[PDB]
Every structure is written in C-alpha cells, then in structure tokens.
Design an enzyme around this catalytic site. Structure first.
Site, PDB file in Angstrom:
ATOM      1  N   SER A 197      63.663 117.035   6.599  1.00  0.00           N
ATOM      2  CA  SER A 197      65.025 117.654   6.748  1.00  0.00           C
ATOM      3  C   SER A 197      65.150 118.743   6.222  1.00  0.00           C
ATOM      4  O   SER A 197      64.317 119.824   6.234  1.00  0.00           O
ATOM      5  CB  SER A 197      65.818 116.307   6.407  1.00  0.00           C
ATOM      6  OG  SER A 197      67.135 116.580   6.561  1.00  0.00           O
ATOM      7  N   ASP A 253      66.561 110.871  15.775  1.00  0.00           N
ATOM      8  CA  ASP A 253      67.351 111.586  14.897  1.00  0.00           C
ATOM      9  C   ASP A 253      68.645 111.589  15.075  1.00  0.00           C
ATOM     10  O   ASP A 253      69.195 112.196  16.121  1.00  0.00           O
ATOM     11  CB  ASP A 253      66.834 112.872  14.474  1.00  0.00           C
ATOM     12  CG  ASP A 253      67.110 113.386  13.009  1.00  0.00           C
ATOM     13  OD1 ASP A 253      68.161 113.237  12.756  1.00  0.00           O
ATOM     14  OD2 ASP A 253      65.983 114.349  12.296  1.00  0.00           O
ATOM     15  N   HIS A 274      65.742 110.009  11.167  1.00  0.00           N
ATOM     16  CA  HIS A 274      65.859 111.491  10.356  1.00  0.00           C
ATOM     17  C   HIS A 274      64.848 111.126   9.175  1.00  0.00           C
ATOM     18  O   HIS A 274      63.971 112.321   9.020  1.00  0.00           O
ATOM     19  CB  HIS A 274      67.276 111.894   9.858  1.00  0.00           C
ATOM     20  CG  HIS A 274      67.266 113.032   9.369  1.00  0.00           C
ATOM     21  ND1 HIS A 274      67.041 114.319   9.588  1.00  0.00           N
ATOM     22  CD2 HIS A 274      67.736 113.435   7.964  1.00  0.00           C
ATOM     23  CE1 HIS A 274      67.312 115.293   9.131  1.00  0.00           C
ATOM     24  NE2 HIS A 274      67.691 114.794   8.005  1.00  0.00           N
TER      25      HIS A 274
HETATM   26  B1  LIG Z   1      67.984 115.572   6.725  1.00  0.00           B
HETATM   27  O1  LIG Z   1      68.410 114.840   5.495  1.00  0.00           O
HETATM   28  C1  LIG Z   1      69.356 116.590   6.971  1.00  0.00           C
HETATM   29  C2  LIG Z   1      70.815 116.001   7.126  1.00  0.00           C
HETATM   30  C3  LIG Z   1      71.751 117.251   7.385  1.00  0.00           C
HETATM   31  C4  LIG Z   1      71.052 118.471   7.353  1.00  0.00           C
HETATM   32  C5  LIG Z   1      71.646 119.844   7.696  1.00  0.00           C
HETATM   33  F1  LIG Z   1      72.850 119.668   7.692  1.00  0.00           F
HETATM   34  F2  LIG Z   1      71.086 120.709   6.529  1.00  0.00           F
HETATM   35  F3  LIG Z   1      71.117 120.365   8.827  1.00  0.00           F
HETATM   36  S1  LIG Z   1      69.401 118.206   6.942  1.00  0.00           S
END
Ligand SMILES: *[B@@](*)([O])C1=[C][C]=C(C(F)(F)F)S1
Ligand SMILES: OB(O)c1ccc(C(F)(F)F)s1
Ligand SMILES: OB(O)c1ccc(C(F)(F)F)s1
Ligand SMILES: [Ca+2]
Ligand SMILES: [Ca+2]
Ligand SMILES: [Ca+2]
Ligand SMILES: [Ca+2]
Ligand SMILES: [Ca+2]
Length: 241
Positions: free
Chosen positions: A89, A186, A216
């Site tokens: 992520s 995701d 995700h």
């Molecule tokens: B994975 O855990 C992610 C959830 C949101 C993300 C971002 F907003 F940074 F893109 S990354």
C-alpha cells in the site's frame, strides 16, 4: 500489540514496509515466509500507527518515510548491505522513493497507489480506520457518528497528497529490478495504479502480477501464499552476492 520486527536469517535482506493506517502485523506473515526461505527481514512501524486515529493526524508522512529509511539504515548497521525494499500500500510508494535515497537490489510494490483519485483514497483510508477503531473501543453508533462528524482535517492528509504526487512525478527515476503486485478487488486504491507504476518506472527488469481474489491488504488475504511464492521467485532472480 503490533511492533517493529527483525527476523534475522541469512545474508540476503528484505525491508518490509506496511500500509497507510496499517501496522507491522500486516507484513509479518510475509516476513515469516521469507525467513523460512532463508531471507532476513526488518519491518518498521510508522509513527502514529496502530493507535487511536487522532495519532495519525498528529504525525506526518515525512516522519513515516523517515521511519522507512531508518529501517533500511538499521539493516545496514546490523550487517545487511544487500536489501530489497518490499512495500504494501503506501509502503510501496515509500519503496519506490526509498530506492532513490538508498541502494537496493530490487523493489516490490504491493497494492501501492499511484495516480487517480488520491484524495479519495487518503480520506477513505483514514476514515475507515477511524470508524473501525471506535467500534473496537466499544462505542455506540451515535457516539461514533458524532466523533466522526468532529473530524478536522490536519496538515497530515494534505502532506500525504503532496507526497504521493511527488513520488508519482519521480517514478521515472526508478531503475532497480521491480515486481509490481496488485489485488484486483482493492477497494482502497485503484488497481490501475499498478499499470501506471509498471509503465513509468525506468527499470529494465520488471514484472507484474494480478490477484483475482484479493483486496488491499494482500499479504494477509486469502491468496497470500501465492503472493509470497511470487515474491520469492522474484527475489531468487536478483543479483545477490
Ligand atoms: B493501503 O493501506 C492504502 C490506503 C490509502 C492509501 C493512500 F491514500 F495513501 F493512497 S494507501
Ligand atoms: O533522509 B532521507 O534520505 C530523506 C528523504 C526525504 C525525507 C523526508 F524527511 F522528507 F521525508 S528524509
Ligand atoms: O514533496 B516533497 O518533495 C516530499 C518530501 C518528502 C516526501 C515523502 F514522500 F517522504 F513524504 S514528499
Ligand atoms: Ca533461523
Ligand atoms: Ca546484530
Ligand atoms: Ca449519546
Ligand atoms: Ca452525522
Ligand atoms: Ca530503462
């Protein structure tokens, strides 16, 4: 409660970087698999994570990236000069940037965001964590709604948006061997991010894998064993001493 971990095995090392609002436990099964395959791993934990949600809003992505760099530097201090950086992520975005700040043998990104509606991913990721945390605290639905309605955005979330755009705009500087992994289901970040990363790195040695039954946090989901095997095959292909 989750903490940083250091699984010392052989001389080949992997720095494991967790996701936004996540924690080291999200990469621990990967760490154990890698350990069974002879690989050392170290997983930092970002400031403010694994804590009440307001702690994220008191922190900053600049700190979290430094936490990632500190994990690389710790591996070096402990005797591991050859390091692959593998990030889940937001950690995958940090893995790309880390490769521009430190010498790595390779990069793995797993469900890393790049492009698209970054603001939506940031706020939905934070708000989902916050709501789930308040549920875990035993709060009733009205108390949760009221606390969520008093959410005040802080500089943290704006900084995260700016940091993601900076990494996007420097991804063409990435040169090291790379495996891009993405879950098709995701619901946090757009899976097309993986195409974008793959297409825009300068890396001459690259591969991409898609997982049809995963979300995700792919390294704890139901196809994790295949993900781990694919990571292993990539590691075995690299220019280790
Ligand atoms: B994975 O855990 C992610 C959830 C949101 C993300 C971002 F907003 F940074 F893109 S990354
Ligand atoms: O130490 B380093 O190579 C860093 C690069 C970017 C950093 C941040 F503090 F802005 F996040 S630190
Ligand atoms: O916008 B800037 O050049 C950035 C400096 C550090 C960044 C982080 F990705 F570590 F957060 S972004
Ligand atoms: Ca051992
Ligand atoms: Ca030591
Ligand atoms: Ca009430
Ligand atoms: Ca309301
Ligand atoms: Ca190239």
């Amino acid at each position: 409660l989750p903490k940083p971990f250091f699984f010392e095995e052989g001389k080949r090392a992997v720095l494991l970087l967790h996701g936004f609002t996540g924690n080291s436990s999200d990469v621990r099964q990967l760490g154990r698999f890698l350990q069974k395959k002879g690989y050392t791993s170290y997983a930092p934990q970002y400031e403010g994570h694994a804590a009440p949600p307001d702690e994220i809003l008191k922190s900053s992505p600049f700190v979290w990236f430094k936490d990632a760099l500190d994990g690389y530097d710790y591996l070096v201090e402990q005797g591991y000069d050859e390091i692959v950086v593998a990030g889940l992520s937001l950690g995958g975005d940090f893995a790309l940037k880390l490769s521009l700040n430190r010498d790595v043998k390779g990069i793995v990104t797993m469900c890393a965001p790049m492009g698209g509606k970054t603001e939506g991913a940031i706020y939905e990721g934070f708000l989902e964590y916050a709501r789930n945390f308040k549920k875990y605290e035993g709060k009733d639905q009205e108390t949760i709604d009221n606390e969520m309605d008093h959410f005040k955005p802080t500089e943290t979330l704006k900084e995260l948006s700016e940091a993601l755009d900076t990494i996007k705009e420097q991804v063409d500087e990435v040169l090291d061997p790379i495996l891009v992994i993405q879950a098709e289901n995701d619901n946090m970040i757009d899976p097309q991010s993986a195409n974008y990363i793959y297409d825009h790195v300068d890396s001459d040695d690259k591969n991409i894998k898609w997982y049809s039954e995963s979300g995700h946090v792919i390294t704890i989901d139901k196809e994790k064993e295949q993900v781990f095997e694919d990571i292993y095959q990539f590691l075995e292909s690299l220019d280790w001493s």
